[PDB]
Design a binder for this molecule. Structure first.
Ligand SMILES: Nc1ncnc2c1ncn2[C@@H]1O[C@H](CNS(=O)(=O)NC(=O)CCCC[C@@H]2SC[C@@H]3NC(=O)N[C@@H]32)C[C@H]1O
Length: 262
């Protein structure tokens, strides 16, 4: 079936392309299997390792982490599953939220040319959507002085294997997606967006708003704690928070699950 469309990654090739002069990535490893790539890089940092510019890719992930204590499902070689380490202590804590949004933007731009149906872009905070389905999910976790950015991108992953609301490049029409080429594109896009975030480049916010599916749409936001708030998304502030219009009132949300309404 789709197993024939899932060749292994080439670690040697990825290292040659992404490690060296002109690139900020210092280390890249491809593991056959792990519990969570995010947990692994957090564990390295917890033992005193400098994980800035360190890339960890897993062919398979058995205990993936989602946001708010949720999970992330995967089968072998069906996704691009990676985590990167980013030094953030040199940047004001108020702006750390934008690092998360920058990652989603990079993932989208890396695969966008391959895909162009309706509802294709970014859902606040870190959802890469295409044709209404979730193509990629991003998780950012703090381990001072670092932030670990995790990316789960469905390449050939069937929705029936992971989640009914999911989608993949293959299910979007991409017959033979090359994970080696896509992973390379993703990490080069990611490096650029991280640099932009670090230097507070205005283009980062401008580019995000251009790909936003949430801004200008009627939304139901499910807040931490179980409360729901219905309004219209208007903008993103300087902290990466979602600005909602609720009957003329402004409600700023730092975290929550967004559902685009009719
Ligand atoms: N395959 C999948 N593709 C679409 N959707 C899905 C899928 N596997 C479940 N789901 C569904 O999405 C839900 C998770 N939603 S979420 O709260 O916004 N969390 C996220 O999207 C962030 C996920 C980050 C995963 C990356 S991958 C490597 C790294 N390590 C790690 O443990 N996390 C990060 C749970 C499940 O209902």
């Amino acid at each position: 079936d789709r197993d024939r469309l899932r060749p292994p990654l080439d670690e040697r090739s990825l290292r040659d392309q992404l490690i060296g002069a002109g690139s900020g990535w210092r280390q890249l490893d491809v593991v056959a299997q792990t519990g969570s790539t995010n947990a692994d890089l957090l564990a390295r940092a917890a033992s005193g390792a400098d994980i800035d510019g360190v890339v960890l890719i897993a062919e398979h992930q058995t205990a993936g982490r989602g946001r708010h204590g949720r999970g992330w499902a995967a089968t072998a070689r069906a996704q691009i599953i990676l985590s990167v380490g980013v030094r953030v202590v040199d940047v004001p804590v108020q702006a750390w939220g934008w690092l998360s949004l920058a990652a989603g933007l990079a993932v989208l731009d890396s695969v966008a040319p391959l895909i162009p149906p309706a509802e294709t872009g970014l859902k606040w905070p870190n959802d890469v959507l295409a044709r209404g389905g979730k193509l990629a999910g991003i998780l950012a976790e703090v381990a001072q002085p670092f932030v670990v950015l995790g990316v789960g991108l469905n390449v050939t992953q069937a929705p029936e294997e992971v989640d009914p609301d999911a989608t993949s490049l293959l299910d979007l029409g991409v017959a033979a997606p090359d994970r080696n080429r896509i992973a390379s594109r993703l990490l080069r896009e990611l490096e650029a967006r991280i640099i932009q975030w670090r230097n507070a480049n205005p283009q980062l916010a401008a580019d995000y708003r251009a790909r936003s599916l949430t801004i200008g749409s009627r939304v139901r936001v499910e807040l931490p704690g179980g409360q729901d708030v219905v309004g219209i998304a208007r903008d993103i502030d300087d902290q990466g928070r979602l600005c909602l219009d609720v009957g003329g009132r402004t409600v700023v949300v730092s975290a929550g699950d967004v559902v685009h309404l009719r």
